[model samples]
Target chain A: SFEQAITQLFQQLSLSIPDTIEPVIGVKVGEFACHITEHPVGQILMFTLPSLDNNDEKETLLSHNIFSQDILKPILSWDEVGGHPVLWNRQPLNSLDNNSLYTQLEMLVQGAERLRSFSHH
Target chain B: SFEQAITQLFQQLSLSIPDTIEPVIGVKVGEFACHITEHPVGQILMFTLPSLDNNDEKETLLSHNIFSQDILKPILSWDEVGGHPVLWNRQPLNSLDNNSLYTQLEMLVQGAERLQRSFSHH
Candidate 1:
């Protein structure tokens, strides 16, 4: 039952997190891990598996803008490549947003770690 | 400074609202109005002008998913039309999320009205 609850939690996040991404990366199922590699206009990496064994670590890059200086300011934009649209608009971040960004990232990391734990149990 | 602040406010919202839309209807300048014509898997209409007198109501539809039953749940998806991608993923909303959606819509309407006010001053 707890496992089912974890699965449902992620499914809910899947619905919410896309509108919040640049390219709108969508969602991926299966065991995975996400980490905040940097902050204040930095990048986060999503992996296919948890733990570091040097032999397996699939990485996907995600941008950090949710709590940056620009915060929720609309830097909305989209691009067309060979006729296909790619919406990835953003604004630059400054040191001013660092304090809050750190606060958000700390929670994000903890959440990630917690999710990773779910994958194991 | 007050006018500049209003302008800045809209600019900021422009940045934040796109990822929230399906086809991502970016920002437009000048005097305009937006109306929530429907809700719970419904559409919103963004107009080119503020007020209506029978012949002046340009309509642009926006979906309401922010506070629907699905709430923050991701029905995230994208599409390709004639080789162009249109990301418009959403889930159905039930009556359970109605009150919250209404609450959210009330605030949205108020905000839209405020912006329309700014456009008139523009």
Candidate 2:
């Protein structure tokens, strides 16, 4: 099951590894830094984004606003762990070709930028 | 592609025809009024909600901010078209029965209600 899921995730990623990052895939879409790693269940594509770090009063409010309002789609959770900003829009491999895969990724890229603008205020 | 997606949806809803309000194939889901139409790319499942109505209050709110506004990006985009604020989710030919489709529909319905209350007060 894990193997099957990872295979799909790799196809979704579809990027040649630069052969340095320990777990493979690594990218920085603007200010949002992200990577994928193997997990016991399947895999994890985690991001350290520039938005919603959960520190400032306004930041925590916006973070809690999304959670309380339940508008979170594809986003598992967002938080700050000891000053490290985290955007936990978690993992599950999908049956998408490179086209849909990139489409979904493009959505995330823009979505991240929107949140970044909101929080960077 | 648009015709095929609409045909598949037609099957799911049985032999009934959508209420045509001037070339518009229309339906209602709960309190939310929606329509089935073709976008440039493909078919669209959209809701016309009063909450998103482009009015003086809507303009005032937009005056404050745009990107900071809270909205969902699941099924698709939220935009104003012809003075009507619409929630448009493009059809996915990915599968015959898509759980995502219904989930997005539900979200749009509830999201409309939520936005309505917020906008009314503001």
Best by TM-score: 2
Q: iRMS values in order, in angstroms?
A: 14.8, 14.6
Please tell me which predicted candidate would have the highest DockQ against the true structure. Answer: 2
Candidate 2 per-residue lDDT, tens place, B17-68, comes to 3343233455566556766554433334444544543343322322221121
Candidate 1's displacement at residue A14, Å, is 18
Off by over 4 Å in 2: A1-26, A35-95, A98-121, B1-15, B18-24, B40-44, B52-85, B98-107, B116-122
TM-score for candidate 1, please give it.
0.20
**Model 1: per-residue lDDT, tens digit, A1-121?**
2223223344544333222323213233334333222212222222122232233211111111111222221111111222211112121122213243233323444433332232221
Worst 10 residues of 2 chain B by lDDT: B62-71
- Cα RMSD (angstroms) for every candidate in the order listed: 18.3, 10.8
Interface DockQ per candidate: 0.02, 0.05
TM-score of each: 0.20, 0.43
